[PDB]
PDB file of N, CA and C in Angstrom:
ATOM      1  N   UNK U   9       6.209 -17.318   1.137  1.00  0.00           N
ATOM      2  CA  UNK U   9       5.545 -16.440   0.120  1.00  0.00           C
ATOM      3  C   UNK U   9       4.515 -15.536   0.819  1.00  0.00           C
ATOM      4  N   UNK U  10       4.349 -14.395   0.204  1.00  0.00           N
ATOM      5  CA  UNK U  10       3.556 -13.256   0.998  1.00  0.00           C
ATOM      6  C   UNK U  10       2.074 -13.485   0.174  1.00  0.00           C
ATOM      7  N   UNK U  11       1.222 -12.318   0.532  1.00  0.00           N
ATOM      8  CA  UNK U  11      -0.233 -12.289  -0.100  1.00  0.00           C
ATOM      9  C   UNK U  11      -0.032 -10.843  -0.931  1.00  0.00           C
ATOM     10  N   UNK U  12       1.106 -10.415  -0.585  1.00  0.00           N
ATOM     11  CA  UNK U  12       1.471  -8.780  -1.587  1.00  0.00           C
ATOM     12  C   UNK U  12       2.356  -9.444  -2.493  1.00  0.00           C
ATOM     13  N   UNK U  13       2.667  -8.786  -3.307  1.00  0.00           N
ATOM     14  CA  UNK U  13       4.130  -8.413  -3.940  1.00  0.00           C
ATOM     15  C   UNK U  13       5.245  -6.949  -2.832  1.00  0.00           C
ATOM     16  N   UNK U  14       6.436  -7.406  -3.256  1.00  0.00           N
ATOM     17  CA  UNK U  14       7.306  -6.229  -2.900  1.00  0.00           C
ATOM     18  C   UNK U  14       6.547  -4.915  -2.722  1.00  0.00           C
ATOM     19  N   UNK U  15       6.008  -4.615  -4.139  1.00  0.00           N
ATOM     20  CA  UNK U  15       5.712  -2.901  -4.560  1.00  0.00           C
ATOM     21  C   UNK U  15       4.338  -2.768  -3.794  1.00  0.00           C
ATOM     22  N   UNK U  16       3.330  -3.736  -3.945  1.00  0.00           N
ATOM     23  CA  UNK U  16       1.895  -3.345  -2.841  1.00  0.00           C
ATOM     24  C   UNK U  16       2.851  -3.109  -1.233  1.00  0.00           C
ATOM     25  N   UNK U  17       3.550  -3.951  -0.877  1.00  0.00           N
ATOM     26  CA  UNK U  17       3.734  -3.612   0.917  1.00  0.00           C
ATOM     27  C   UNK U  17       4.532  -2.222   0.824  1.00  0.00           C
ATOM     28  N   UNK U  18       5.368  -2.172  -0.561  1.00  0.00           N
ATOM     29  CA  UNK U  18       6.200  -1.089   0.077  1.00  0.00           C
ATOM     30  C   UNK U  18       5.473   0.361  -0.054  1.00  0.00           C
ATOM     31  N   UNK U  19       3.902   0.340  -1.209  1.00  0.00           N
ATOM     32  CA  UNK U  19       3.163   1.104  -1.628  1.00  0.00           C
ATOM     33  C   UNK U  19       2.550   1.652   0.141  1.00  0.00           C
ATOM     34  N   UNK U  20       1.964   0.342   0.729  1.00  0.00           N
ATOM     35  CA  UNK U  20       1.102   0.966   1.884  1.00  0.00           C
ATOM     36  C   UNK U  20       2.375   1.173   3.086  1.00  0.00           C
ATOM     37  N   UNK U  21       3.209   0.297   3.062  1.00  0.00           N
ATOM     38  CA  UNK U  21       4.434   0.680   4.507  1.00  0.00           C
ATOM     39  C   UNK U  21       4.251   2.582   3.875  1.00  0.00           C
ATOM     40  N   UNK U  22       4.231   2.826   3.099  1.00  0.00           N
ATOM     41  CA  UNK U  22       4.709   4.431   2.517  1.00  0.00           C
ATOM     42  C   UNK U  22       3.326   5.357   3.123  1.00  0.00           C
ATOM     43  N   UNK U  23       1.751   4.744   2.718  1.00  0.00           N
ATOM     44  CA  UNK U  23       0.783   5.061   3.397  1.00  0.00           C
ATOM     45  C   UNK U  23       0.870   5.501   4.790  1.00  0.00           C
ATOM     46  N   UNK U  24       1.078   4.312   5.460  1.00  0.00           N
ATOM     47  CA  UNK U  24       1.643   4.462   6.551  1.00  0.00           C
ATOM     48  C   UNK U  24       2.493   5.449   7.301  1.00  0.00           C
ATOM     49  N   UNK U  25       2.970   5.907   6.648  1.00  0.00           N
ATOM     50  CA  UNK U  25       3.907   7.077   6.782  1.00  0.00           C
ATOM     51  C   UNK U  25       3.142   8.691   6.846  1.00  0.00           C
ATOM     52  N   UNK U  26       2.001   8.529   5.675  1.00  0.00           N
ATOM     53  CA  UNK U  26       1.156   9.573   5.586  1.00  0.00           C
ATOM     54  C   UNK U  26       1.662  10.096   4.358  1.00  0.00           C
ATOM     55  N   UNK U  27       2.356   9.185   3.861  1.00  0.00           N
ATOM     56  CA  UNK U  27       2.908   9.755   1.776  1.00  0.00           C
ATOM     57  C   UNK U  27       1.085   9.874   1.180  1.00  0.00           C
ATOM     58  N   UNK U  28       1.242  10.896   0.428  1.00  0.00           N
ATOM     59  CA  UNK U  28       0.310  10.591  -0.850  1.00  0.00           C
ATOM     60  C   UNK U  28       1.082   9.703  -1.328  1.00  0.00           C
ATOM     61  N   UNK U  29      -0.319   9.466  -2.702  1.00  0.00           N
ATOM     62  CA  UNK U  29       0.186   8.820  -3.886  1.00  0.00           C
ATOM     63  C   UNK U  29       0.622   9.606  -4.534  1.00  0.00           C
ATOM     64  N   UNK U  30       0.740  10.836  -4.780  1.00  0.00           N
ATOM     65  CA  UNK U  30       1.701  11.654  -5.562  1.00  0.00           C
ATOM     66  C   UNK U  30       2.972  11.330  -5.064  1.00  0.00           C
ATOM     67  N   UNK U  31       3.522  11.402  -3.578  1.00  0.00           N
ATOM     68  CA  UNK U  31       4.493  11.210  -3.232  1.00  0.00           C
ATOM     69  C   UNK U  31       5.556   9.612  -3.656  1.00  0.00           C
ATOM     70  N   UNK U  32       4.445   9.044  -3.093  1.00  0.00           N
ATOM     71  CA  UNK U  32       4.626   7.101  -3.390  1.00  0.00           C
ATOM     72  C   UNK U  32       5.047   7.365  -4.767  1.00  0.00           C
ATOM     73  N   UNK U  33       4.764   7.908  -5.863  1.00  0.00           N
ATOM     74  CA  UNK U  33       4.546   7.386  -6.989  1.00  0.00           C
ATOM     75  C   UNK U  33       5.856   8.055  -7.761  1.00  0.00           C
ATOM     76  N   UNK U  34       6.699   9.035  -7.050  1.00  0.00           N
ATOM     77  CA  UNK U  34       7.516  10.044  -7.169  1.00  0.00           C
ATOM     78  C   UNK U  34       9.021   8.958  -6.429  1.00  0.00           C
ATOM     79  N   UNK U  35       8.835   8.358  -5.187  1.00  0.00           N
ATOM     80  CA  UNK U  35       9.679   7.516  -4.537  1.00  0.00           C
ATOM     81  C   UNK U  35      10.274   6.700  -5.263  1.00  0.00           C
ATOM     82  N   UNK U  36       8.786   5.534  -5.820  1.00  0.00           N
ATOM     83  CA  UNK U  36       9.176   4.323  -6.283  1.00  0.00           C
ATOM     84  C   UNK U  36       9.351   4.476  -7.441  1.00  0.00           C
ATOM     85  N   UNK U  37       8.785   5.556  -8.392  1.00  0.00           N
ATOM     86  CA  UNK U  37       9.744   5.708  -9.749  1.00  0.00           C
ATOM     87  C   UNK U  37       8.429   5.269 -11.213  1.00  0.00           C
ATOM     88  N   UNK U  38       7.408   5.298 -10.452  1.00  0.00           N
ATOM     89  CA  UNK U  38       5.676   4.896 -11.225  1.00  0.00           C
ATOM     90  C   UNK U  38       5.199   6.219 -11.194  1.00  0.00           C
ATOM     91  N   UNK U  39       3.708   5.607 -12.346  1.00  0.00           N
ATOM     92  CA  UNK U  39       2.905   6.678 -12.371  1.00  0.00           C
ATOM     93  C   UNK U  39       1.549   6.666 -10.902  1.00  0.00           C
ATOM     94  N   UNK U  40       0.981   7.711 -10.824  1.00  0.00           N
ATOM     95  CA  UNK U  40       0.088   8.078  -9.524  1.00  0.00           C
ATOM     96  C   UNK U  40      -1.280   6.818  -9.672  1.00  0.00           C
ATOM     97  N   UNK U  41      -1.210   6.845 -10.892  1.00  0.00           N
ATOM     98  CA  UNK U  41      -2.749   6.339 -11.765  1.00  0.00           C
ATOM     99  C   UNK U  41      -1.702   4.827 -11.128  1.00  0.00           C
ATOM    100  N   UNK U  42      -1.149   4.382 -10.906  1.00  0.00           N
ATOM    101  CA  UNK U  42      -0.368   2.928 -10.983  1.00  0.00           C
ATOM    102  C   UNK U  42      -0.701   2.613  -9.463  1.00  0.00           C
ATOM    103  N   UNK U  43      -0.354   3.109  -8.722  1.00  0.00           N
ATOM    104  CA  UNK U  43      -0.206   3.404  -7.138  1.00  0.00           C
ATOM    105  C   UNK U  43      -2.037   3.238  -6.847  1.00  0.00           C
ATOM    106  N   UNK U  44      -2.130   3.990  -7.335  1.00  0.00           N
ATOM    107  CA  UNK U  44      -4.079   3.654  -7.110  1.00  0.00           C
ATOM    108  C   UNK U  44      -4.245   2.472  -7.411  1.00  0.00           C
ATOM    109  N   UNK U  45      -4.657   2.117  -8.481  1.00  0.00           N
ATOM    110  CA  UNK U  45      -4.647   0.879  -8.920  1.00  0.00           C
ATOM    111  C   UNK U  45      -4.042  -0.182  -7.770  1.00  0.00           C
ATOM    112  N   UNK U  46      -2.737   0.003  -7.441  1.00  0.00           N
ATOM    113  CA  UNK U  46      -2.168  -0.957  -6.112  1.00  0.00           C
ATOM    114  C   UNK U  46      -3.056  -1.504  -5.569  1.00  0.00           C
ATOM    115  N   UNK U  47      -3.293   0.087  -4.847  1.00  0.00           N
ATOM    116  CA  UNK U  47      -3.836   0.215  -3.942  1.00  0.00           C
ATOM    117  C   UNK U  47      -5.506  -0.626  -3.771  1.00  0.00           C
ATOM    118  N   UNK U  48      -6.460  -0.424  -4.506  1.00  0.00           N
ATOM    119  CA  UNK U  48      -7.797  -0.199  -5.195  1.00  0.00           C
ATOM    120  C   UNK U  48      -7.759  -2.161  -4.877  1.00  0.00           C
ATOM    121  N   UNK U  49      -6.662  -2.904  -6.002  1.00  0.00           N
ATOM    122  CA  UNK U  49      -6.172  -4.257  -6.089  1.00  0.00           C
ATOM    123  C   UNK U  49      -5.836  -4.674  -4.690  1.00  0.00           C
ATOM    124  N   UNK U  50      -5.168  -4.101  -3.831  1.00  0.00           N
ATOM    125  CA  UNK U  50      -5.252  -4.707  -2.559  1.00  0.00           C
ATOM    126  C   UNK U  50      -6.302  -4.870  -1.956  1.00  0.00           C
ATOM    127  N   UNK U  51      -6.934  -4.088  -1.376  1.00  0.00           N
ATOM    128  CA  UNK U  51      -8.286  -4.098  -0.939  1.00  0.00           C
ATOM    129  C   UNK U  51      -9.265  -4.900  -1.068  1.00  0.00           C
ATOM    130  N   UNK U  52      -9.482  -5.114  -2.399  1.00  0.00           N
ATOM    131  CA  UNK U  52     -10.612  -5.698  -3.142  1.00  0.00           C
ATOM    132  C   UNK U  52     -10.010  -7.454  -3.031  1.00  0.00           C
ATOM    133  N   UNK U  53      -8.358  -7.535  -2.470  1.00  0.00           N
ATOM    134  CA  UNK U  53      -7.710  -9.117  -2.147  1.00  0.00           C
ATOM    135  C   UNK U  53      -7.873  -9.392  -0.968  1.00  0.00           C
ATOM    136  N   UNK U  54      -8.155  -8.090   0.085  1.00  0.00           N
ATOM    137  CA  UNK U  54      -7.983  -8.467   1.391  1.00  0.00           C
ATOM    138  C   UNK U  54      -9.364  -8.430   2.079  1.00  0.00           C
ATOM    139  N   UNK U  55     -10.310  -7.942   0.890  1.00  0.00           N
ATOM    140  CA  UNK U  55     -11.615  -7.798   1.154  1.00  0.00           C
ATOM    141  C   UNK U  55     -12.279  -6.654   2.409  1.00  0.00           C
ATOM    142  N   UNK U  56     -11.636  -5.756   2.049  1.00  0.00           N
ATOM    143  CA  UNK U  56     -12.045  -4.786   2.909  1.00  0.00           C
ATOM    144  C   UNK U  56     -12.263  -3.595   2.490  1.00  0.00           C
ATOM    145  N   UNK U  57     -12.942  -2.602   3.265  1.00  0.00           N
ATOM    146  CA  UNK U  57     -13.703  -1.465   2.987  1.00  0.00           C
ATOM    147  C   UNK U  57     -12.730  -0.172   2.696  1.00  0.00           C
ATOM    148  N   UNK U  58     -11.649  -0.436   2.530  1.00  0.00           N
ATOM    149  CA  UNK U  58     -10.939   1.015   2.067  1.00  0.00           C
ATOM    150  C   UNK U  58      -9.465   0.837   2.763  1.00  0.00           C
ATOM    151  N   UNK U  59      -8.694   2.076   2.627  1.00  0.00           N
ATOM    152  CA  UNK U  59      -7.285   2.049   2.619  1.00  0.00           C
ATOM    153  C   UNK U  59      -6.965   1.935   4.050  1.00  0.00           C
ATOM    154  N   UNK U  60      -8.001   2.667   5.212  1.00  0.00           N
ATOM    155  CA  UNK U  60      -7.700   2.411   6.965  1.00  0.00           C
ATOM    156  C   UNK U  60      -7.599   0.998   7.034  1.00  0.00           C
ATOM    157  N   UNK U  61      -8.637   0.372   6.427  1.00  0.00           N
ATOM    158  CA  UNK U  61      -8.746  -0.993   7.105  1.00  0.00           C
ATOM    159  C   UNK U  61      -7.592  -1.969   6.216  1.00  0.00           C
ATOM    160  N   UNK U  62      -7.385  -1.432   4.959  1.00  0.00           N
ATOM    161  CA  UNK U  62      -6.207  -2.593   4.099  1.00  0.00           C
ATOM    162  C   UNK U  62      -5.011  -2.038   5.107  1.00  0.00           C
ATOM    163  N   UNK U  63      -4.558  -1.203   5.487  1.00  0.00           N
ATOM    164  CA  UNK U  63      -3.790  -0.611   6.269  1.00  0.00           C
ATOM    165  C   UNK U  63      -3.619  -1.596   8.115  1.00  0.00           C
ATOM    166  N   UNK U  64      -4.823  -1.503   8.596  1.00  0.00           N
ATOM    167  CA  UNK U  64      -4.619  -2.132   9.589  1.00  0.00           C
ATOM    168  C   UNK U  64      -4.679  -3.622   9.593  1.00  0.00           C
ATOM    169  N   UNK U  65      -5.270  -4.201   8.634  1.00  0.00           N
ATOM    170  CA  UNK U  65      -5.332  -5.910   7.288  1.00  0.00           C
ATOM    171  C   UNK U  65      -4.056  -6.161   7.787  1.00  0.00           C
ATOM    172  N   UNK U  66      -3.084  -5.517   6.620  1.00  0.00           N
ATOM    173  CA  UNK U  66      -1.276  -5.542   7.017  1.00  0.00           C
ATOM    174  C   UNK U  66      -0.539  -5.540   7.931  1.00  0.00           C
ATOM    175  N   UNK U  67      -1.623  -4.784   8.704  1.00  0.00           N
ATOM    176  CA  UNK U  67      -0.389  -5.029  10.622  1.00  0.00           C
ATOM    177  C   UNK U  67      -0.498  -5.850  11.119  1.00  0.00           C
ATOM    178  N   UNK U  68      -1.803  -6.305  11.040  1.00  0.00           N
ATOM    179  CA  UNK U  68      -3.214  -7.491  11.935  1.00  0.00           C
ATOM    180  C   UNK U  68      -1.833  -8.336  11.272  1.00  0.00           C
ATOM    181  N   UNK U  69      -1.371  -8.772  10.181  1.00  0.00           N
ATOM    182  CA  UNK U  69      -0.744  -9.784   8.971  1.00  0.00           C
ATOM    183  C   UNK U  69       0.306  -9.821   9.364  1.00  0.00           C
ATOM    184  N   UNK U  70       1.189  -8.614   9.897  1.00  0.00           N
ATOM    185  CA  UNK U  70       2.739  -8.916   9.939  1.00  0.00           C
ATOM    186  C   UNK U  70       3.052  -8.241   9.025  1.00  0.00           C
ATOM    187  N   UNK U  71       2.587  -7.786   7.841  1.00  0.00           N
ATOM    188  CA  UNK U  71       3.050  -7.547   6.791  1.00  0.00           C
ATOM    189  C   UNK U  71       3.648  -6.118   6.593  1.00  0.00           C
ATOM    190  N   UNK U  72       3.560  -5.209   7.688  1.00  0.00           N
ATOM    191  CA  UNK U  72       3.864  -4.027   7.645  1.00  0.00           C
ATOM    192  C   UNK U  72       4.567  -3.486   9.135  1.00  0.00           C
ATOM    193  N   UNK U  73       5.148  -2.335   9.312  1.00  0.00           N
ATOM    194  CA  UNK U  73       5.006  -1.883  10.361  1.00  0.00           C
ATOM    195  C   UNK U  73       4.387  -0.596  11.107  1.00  0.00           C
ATOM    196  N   UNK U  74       4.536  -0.053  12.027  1.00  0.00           N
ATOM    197  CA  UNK U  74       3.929   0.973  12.089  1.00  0.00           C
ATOM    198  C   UNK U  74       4.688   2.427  12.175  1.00  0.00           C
ATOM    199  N   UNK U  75       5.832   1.888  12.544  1.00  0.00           N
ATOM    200  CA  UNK U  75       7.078   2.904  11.750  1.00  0.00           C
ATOM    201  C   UNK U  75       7.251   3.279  10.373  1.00  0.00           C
TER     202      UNK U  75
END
């Protein structure tokens, strides 16, 4: 079992990429306001200061890549 769901890893693997959330939110088939929220909810689980560091959280984790 992970510490995401599916849609949070596949939300930031997409970050990662350099997607907005306009973009993300256009991909996966949600609203922008939804994708924030993800996002906002991860952070505040992984206890860290913003989207660089939930971002590098996930690699540190395994949970992402950098491709």
């Amino acid at each position: 079992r992970s510490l995401l769901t599916g849609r949070e890893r596949e939300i930031f693997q997409l970050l990662v990429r350099d997607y907005s959330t306009k973009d993300i939110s256009i991909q996966l088939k949600i609203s922008e306001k939804t994708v924030r929220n993800h996002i906002s909810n991860t952070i505040q689980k992984l206890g860290v200061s913003g989207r660089s560091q939930a971002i590098l959280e996930l690699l540190r984790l395994g949970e992402l890549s950098l491709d």
